[PDB]
Amino acid sequence: PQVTLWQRPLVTIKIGGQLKEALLDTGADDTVLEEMSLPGRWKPKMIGGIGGFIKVRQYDQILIEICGHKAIGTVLVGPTPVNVIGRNLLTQIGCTLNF
Amino acid sequence: PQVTLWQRPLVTIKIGGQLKEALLDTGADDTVLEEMSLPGRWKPKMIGGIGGFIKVRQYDQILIEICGHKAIGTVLVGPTPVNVIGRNLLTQIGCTLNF
Ligand SMILES: Nc1cccc(CN2C(=O)N(Cc3cccc(N)c3)[C@H](Cc3ccccc3)[C@H](O)[C@@H](O)[C@H]2Cc2ccccc2)c1
Structure with missing residues (x-):
């Protein structure tokens, strides 16, 4: 869309x-x-944002559907305010980004 | 583009x-x-990101040219590690965004 x-x-x-x-x-x-329950193994990671850093745990090969579209990749689950x-x-x- | x-x-x-x-x-x-030099006065505000919150200075009515397009708006200046x-x-x- x-x-x-x-x-x-x-x-x-x-x-x-x-x-x-x-x-x-x-x-x-x-x-x-x-934070949400994901099954599997994960490794700790930390990421920076505006504000400072959070400790996060990394899951790889996670399937996501986004709209109908499927993809698989790395997702970091952590104390963010919003899911990004x-x-x-x-x-x-x-x-794509367009202007 | x-x-x-x-x-x-x-x-x-x-x-x-x-x-x-x-x-x-x-x-x-x-x-x-x-952080940079803009002329004029500004109000303090704080914003939330990941990792927490930072305090910034709000300028209103600032001209910016973004890839050659001019715009006027509020810019917040402060301790971000990247310009956004x-x-x-x-x-x-x-x-626009599209997919
Ligand atoms: N690797 C990574 C993954 C996910 C998020 C971030 C860190 N980010 C933020 O903290 N943001 C707060 C931000 C940035 C600018 C303005 C505002 N109002 C908020 C928002 C996302 C967001 C988080 C929480 C609440 C709302 C939005 C921005 O939209 C994101 O692109 C980046 C901006 C950024 C900051 C530092 C370094 C690189 C990129 C980093």
């Missing part, structure tokens, strides 16, 4: 059986979700 | 007679730039 930026570019995602909403975020290199889909996944759903 | 998201979407801006690069950021509601152009200016230059 084409999305204009008058409102937050929010989308529905399905991850691990659960349905969420998440912000499409061109400025994020990574995807990070608030970052460039790692945006490339897979073919997302 | 069209920007894909395989690399970070940076653009040149001209702000306060100075030339900078910044990140086109659909997830950000506000424009936040690193958020939805308040992205909207003025007609930026």
Whole structure:
């Protein structure tokens, strides 16, 4: 779809059986979700943002549906305020920025 | 133009007679730039990011040229580690997201 930026570019995602909403975020290199149960192994990671750093745990090879689109990648689950889909996944759903 | 998201979407801006690069950021509601000299007065505010919150200075009615397009808006200046152009200016230059 084409999305204009008058409102937050929010989308529905399905991850691990659960349905969420998440912000499409061109400025994020990574995807990070608030705490949710994911199965599997994970490794700790830390990421920086405005504000400072958070400790996060990294899951790889996670399937996500974003709108209908499926993709698989790394998701970081952590204490973010908002669930962010970052460039790692945006490339897979073919997302483009246009002006 | 069209920007894909395989690399970070940076653009040149001209702000306060100075030339900078910044990140086109659909997830950000506000424009936040690193410390620099803008003329004029400003109010303090704080903003939340990941990792927490920072205090910034709000300037209103500032001219910025983003990739050659001019815009006027609120810019926040403060301790970000990267310059971020958020939805308040992205909207003025007609930026769309699409997939
Ligand atoms: N790797 C990574 C993954 C996910 C998020 C971030 C860190 N980010 C933020 O903290 N933001 C707060 C931010 C940035 C600018 C303005 C505002 N209002 C908020 C928002 C996302 C956001 C988080 C929490 C609440 C709302 C939005 C912005 O939209 C994101 O692109 C980046 C901006 C950024 C900051 C530092 C370094 C690189 C990129 C980093």
